Amino acid sequence: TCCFECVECPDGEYSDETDASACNKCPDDFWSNENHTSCIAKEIEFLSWT
Amino acid sequence: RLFINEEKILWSGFSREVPFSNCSRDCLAGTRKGIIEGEPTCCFECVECPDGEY
Numbered sequence: 001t002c003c004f005e006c007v008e009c010p011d012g013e014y015s016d017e018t019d020a021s022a023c024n025k026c027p028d029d030f031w032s033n034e035n036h037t038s039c040i041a042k043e044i045e046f047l048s049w050t
Numbered sequence: 051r052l053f054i055n056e057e058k059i060l061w062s063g064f065s066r067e068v069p070f071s072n073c074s075r076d077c078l079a080g081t082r083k084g085i086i087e088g089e090p091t092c093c094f095e096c097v098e099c100p101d102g103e104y
């Protein structure tokens with residue numbers, strides 16, 4: 001068990017610890033960053049006045 | 051070197067079925083091994099595969 005390899009988390013999952021051992025699922029109304037290091041809020045698209 | 055005839059072995063003296071000792075139920079299919087911290091590599095978690103893989 002002392003010897004292991006590092007594999008990136010899939011889309012929609014992140015991690016913020018040194019040795020993750022598991023990919024934490026992103027909470028609802030949030031999505032993973034580009035580097036899968038911190039969830040960010042999604043985007044709402046509608047015909048706005050801005 | 052080893053030769054064992056299983057037809058004449060009575061497990062626990064009465065049973066006729068080979069017992070089980072593995073620390074972890076086998077992962078069935080379409081699933082991946084996992085890691086439990088602080089425990090030997092013999093014991094795992096059976097996580098499911100990411101979308102788009104097999």
Ligand SMILES: *[C@@H]1O[C@H](CO)[C@@H](O[C@@H]2O[C@H](CO)[C@@H](O)[C@H](O)[C@H]2NC(C)=O)[C@H](O)[C@H]1NC(C)=O
Nearest residue numbers: 068069070071072073074075076077091092093
């Ligand atoms: C208990 O674990 C052993 C090994 O950890 C399993 O033996 C393997 O069985 C599969 C098929 O089920 C074979 O393809 C492997 O080659 C076997 N491994 C070895 C090292 O021989 C055993 O099947 C497990 N018990 C149960 C009930 O699943």
Ligand SMILES: [Ca+2]
Nearest residue numbers: 087088089090
């Ligand atoms: Ca230990």
